[PDB]
Amino acid sequence: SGFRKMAFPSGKVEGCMVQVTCGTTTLNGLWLDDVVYCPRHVICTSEDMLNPNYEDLLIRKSNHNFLVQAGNVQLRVIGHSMQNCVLKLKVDTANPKTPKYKFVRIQPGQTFSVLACYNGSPSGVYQCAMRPNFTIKGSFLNGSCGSVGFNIDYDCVSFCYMHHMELPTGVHAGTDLEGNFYGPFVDRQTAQAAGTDTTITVNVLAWLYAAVINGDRWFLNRFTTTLNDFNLVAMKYNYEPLTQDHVDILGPLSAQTGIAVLDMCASLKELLQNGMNGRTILGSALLEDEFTPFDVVRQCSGVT
Amino acid sequence: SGFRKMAFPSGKVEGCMVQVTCGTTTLNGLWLDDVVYCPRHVICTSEDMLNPNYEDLLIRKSNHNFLVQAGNVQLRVIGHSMQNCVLKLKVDTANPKTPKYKFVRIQPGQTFSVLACYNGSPSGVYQCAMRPNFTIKGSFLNGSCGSVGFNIDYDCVSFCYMHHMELPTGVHAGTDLEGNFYGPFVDRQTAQAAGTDTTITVNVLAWLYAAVINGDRWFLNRFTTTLNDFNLVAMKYNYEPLTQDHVDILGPLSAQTGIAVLDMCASLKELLQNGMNGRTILGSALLEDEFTPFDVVRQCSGVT
Ligand SMILES: O=C(Cc1cccc(Cl)n1)Nc1cncc2ccccc12
Ligand SMILES: O=C(Cc1cccc(Cl)n1)Nc1cncc2ccccc12
């Protein structure tokens, strides 16, 4: 028992991190096979960041201007190309540590691990979620660009995020591994509107099931609700609407605990309306929404 | 910016995890050089767990009864010995992936990363602290024994914890890498008193400095306090007493923010006495105490 914000083991991803330098800018790259993926803003100086024309800026750059370093060895760049907001640097050496991998574009509400890197070296690993407003609440400093987000299925790493920006609000924006930003964000130093950060209702419910599994049952009440009644309360509290797909996804957790999804919804409804009254749930004084029903099941069953 | 419960990259430790089976019991082992370290309770059946005489139980075991598997290859055990509550299995092959390492016994209040494992395979990585009552609030299921806690200094892994037990209360107990339990716990299935779980005051203060660094300044007030006045409030709220050593350890954070330690103490004092009033600090509704002043500085400076 015990429930923790748990990240995937990062070793497979550590073996892919490299440092990419272009001119005066240094950020992280992901080395998979003979290609290094990195944010295209590696070609920009701070001056260029106001209104960059990446196509025009890229024209002034040749293969030899992209300095790629893996550990302490330099990689030879034999090709370069821009795919949306990522640069793909073709190197002459395939990464001998390339794991089995996929490039996936996740949905808002899904969770993933981030290996925060600086100068191609990993500094830490943490678990986060793609928010409904397509931002992430990471922990990133200057130089962390090119740090990636991933999920692991046994031995296959599904890369889902590459870090690009910090918005003026302190939240983070980035792309999938094809260079498409999550959300309406652009790689420009301009006023960008993040949007309402709603709570991922299905994830809160999964975490309430994790609490019951782990013995915290104080919030369980004698009431039930309907999807429509629950959603009237959920909208009022900026919670994502709960759908029948979400009820179905909570099926395994509902079965394991013997608590019907709509009964857990009524518990959540009362927690929203009355607060926690100074009490905690799994050592938290707020409702946690960065665990999916899959994360809860995985953590409570010990999938390796 | 952004502040997260961040763990060390686990790759160096993943390369050391093995599965140790003795009879019907399987748990994790740590393979460093030609020695596999594991909890001595690997020799016990559930029946033996009530009152085990490990010396007598060990006599019935020979090298060939300890099945050590690294990945899918079997390691040949050429020696075995008990050191306090750990078994050290001498194998004929040195781990080719042994990183630079140390065995250290941490103090209550210090933090470390845990690589949770099952059958020698890692499932997740999370950050935790050794509580003042010498328990840890981990996330561990049956089979996780032998999972380790560690810190990394550039390339040197300092192993500090090996998981052994879950107490009836759901908290976890374990040893350092010499087999000495943290706290008064014994590897026996008996009624064991964890003790008062106090709050690590110096860590709360460090996290308050991290909040100011990251822009959350609502809790900063116009007051100051003294160590003795602060401690009168701290004892009332089961907070660890704050000493001049702790004030000194917060020096760098105090300098970076321009907020004197005793002024942050007065802020903490008012947060304790008045509560958060439904507000959050770094996305938390309670005072976080699992970040040391070193963790805060490391995260805010990007040490790799
Ligand atoms: O945001 C940028 C650079 C940038 C500026 C404008 C547009 C684009 Cl695409 N990229 N880098 C950072 C990322 N994450 C965290 C940071 C923390 C401090 C300073 C920079 C940080
Ligand atoms: O506590 C034990 C086995 C045990 C029993 C008595 C004494 C000793 Cl030294 N060891 N194993 C576990 C560790 N962590 C978490 C667990 C969760 C569920 C079931 C067992 C768990």
Residues of chain A with Cβ-Cβ distance to B135 below 8 Å are none
- How many Cβ pairs within 8 Å bridge chains A and B? 149
C-beta of residue A115 within 8 angstroms of C-beta of residue A25: no
The beta-carbon neighbor of A304 closest among B5, B122, B276 is B122
In this structure, are residues A203 and A109 in contact, taking their beta carbons and an 8 Å threshold?
A: yes
Q: Report the candidate in A56, A68, A57 with the shortest Cα–Cα distance to residue A20.
A: A68
Q: Give the mutation target among A165, A175, A188, A190 for probing the ligand 1 site: most ligand atoms within 8 A of CB.
A: A165
Verify whether the Cβ–Cβ distance B299 to A139 is below 8 Å. yes
Atom of ligand 2 nearest to the CA of B41: 9
Q: Per DSSP, what are the bridge partners of residue B151?
A: B158
* Structure determination method: X-ray
- Max CA-CA distance within chain B? 69
Q: Helix-strand-coil percent breakdown of chain B, rounded to 5?
A: 25, 30, 45
Domains in chain A (CATH in brackets) are 1-14+100-197 (2.40.10.10), 15-99 (2.40.10.10), 198-301 (1.10.1840.10)
Neighboring chain B residues of A116 at a CB cutoff of 8 Å: 6, 302
**Secondary structure class of A86 (helix, strand, coil):** strand
Please say whether the beta carbons of A157 and A113 come within 8 A.
no
Which atom of ligand 2 has the smallest separation from the CA of B39? 9
A115–B2 C-beta distance less than 8 A = no
- Residues with Cβ within 8 Å of residue A292, at least 6 apart in sequence: A109, A110, A111, A129, A202, A203, A206
3-state helix, strand, coil in chain A (%, to 5): 25, 30, 45
Residue A252, judged by CB atoms within 10 A of its CB (0-12, 13-18, 19+), counts as middle
Location of structure tokens 């995890």 = B17
Concatenate the DSSP letters of all residues of A20-83 into one string. EEETTEEEEEEEETTEEEEEGGGG--TTGGGS--HHHHHHT--GGGEEEEETTEEEPEEEEEEE
Contacts of B221 (CB under 8 A, 6+ apart): B266, B267, B270
B204 is written with which tokens? 């709360």
The CA R_g of chain B, rounded to the nearest whole Å, is 21
- H-type alpha helices, chain B: 11-14, 54-59, 201-213, 227-236, 244-249, 251-257, 261-274, 293-301
CA of B41 from ligand 2 middle (Å) equals 10
Ligand 2 pocket, residues with Cβ under 6 angstroms: A 1; B 41, 49, 140-142, 144-145, 164-166, 187-189
Q: What is the resolution of this structure in A?
A: 1.8
Centre a 10 Å sphere on the Cβ of residue A58 and count the other Cβ atoms it contains: 16
Residue B125 near residue A7, CB atoms below 8 Å? yes
Active centre residues of A (catalytic): 41, 145
Q: Residues of B with catalytic annotation? A: 41, 145
